[PDB]
Amino acid sequence: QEQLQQPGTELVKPGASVRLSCKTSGYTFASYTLHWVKQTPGQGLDWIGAIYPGNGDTSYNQKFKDKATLTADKSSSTAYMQLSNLTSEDSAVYYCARLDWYFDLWGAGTTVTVSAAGSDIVLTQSPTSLAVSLGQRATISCKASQSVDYDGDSYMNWYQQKPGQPPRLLIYAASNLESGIPARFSGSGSGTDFTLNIHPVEEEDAATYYCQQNNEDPRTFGGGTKLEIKLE
Ligand SMILES: [Cl-]
Ligand SMILES: [Cl-]
Ligand code: NA
Ligand code: NA
Numbered sequence: 534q535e536q537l538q539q540p541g542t543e544l545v546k547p548g549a550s551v552r553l554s555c556k557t558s559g560y561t562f563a564s565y566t567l568h569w570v571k572q573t574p575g576q577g578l579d580w581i582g583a584i585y586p587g588n589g590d591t592s593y594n595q596k597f598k599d600k601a602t603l604t605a606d607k608s609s610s611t612a613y614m615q616l617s618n619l620t621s622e623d624s625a626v627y628y629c630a631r632l633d634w635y636f637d638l639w640g641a642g643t644t645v646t647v648s649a650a651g652s653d654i655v656l657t658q659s660p661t662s663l664a665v666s667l668g669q670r671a672t673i674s675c676k677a678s679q680s681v682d683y684d685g686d687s688y689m690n691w692y693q694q695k696p697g698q699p700p701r702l703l704i705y706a707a708s709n710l711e712s713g714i715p716a717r718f719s720g721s722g723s724g725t726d727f728t729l730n731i732h733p734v735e736e737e738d739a740a741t742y743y744c745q746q747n748n749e750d751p752r753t754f755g756g757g758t759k760l761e762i763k764l765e
Pocket of ligand 4: 635636
């Protein structure tokens with residue numbers, strides 16, 4: 534089975550550097566781009582950059598160009614991201630993943646806790662949290678600052694992250710259910726406006742949902758919507 538394995542936690546000091554690892558298995562490491570993603574409560578997910586492990590070629594989001602360095606070690610099938618000059622602003626969970634929807638695969642993420650006691654497309658989700666009773670409908674909006682469409686296809690996906698589990702693809706290209714996702718989920722929209730629907734909601738559906746566009750670089754994500762069950 535294909536896996537990306539990341540250590541759970543790194544507790545680190547301001548000003549230090551930390552090297553995060555992503556040990557891959559179950560597929561040819563050299564042949565698939567790997568991406569790294571930062572998660573925070575307020576900013577949702579941020580695309581850091583990506584590496585093609587076969588040759589080591591990298592691309593970085595301008596905002597992380599000095600903070601992150603991506604490398605790949607083909608002899609151990611492991612990708613690494615160094616974060617340098619740590620500050621409190623680096624405390625976050627960092628995932629490695631294959632982000633193209635057809636190869637969707639996520640590691641469980643490494644929590645990096647920096648501890649000292651002392652024209653990109655913007656995606657806006659609405660609401661950012663909601664509680665819905667069992668059996669009822671959850672509806673969540675994602676709006677982009679510019680169109681994410683090309684040739685009649687929307688380059689926008691939705692991701693779900695259930696509590697304690699890695700993120701996973703839920704809907705790709707606006708309206709397609711990923712394999713294995715239940716029929717109670719549905720997605721609509723085009724251009725700049727998209728909507729996720731879940732009905733009837735079940736307990737398993739409690740999760741954080743994120744939209745993402747990959748029409749233009751850098752790939753960007755919404756800030757996340759946390760759905761809970763409203764106990765009745
Ligand atoms: Cl809102
Ligand atoms: Cl269902
Ligand atoms: Na391998
Ligand atoms: Na596939």
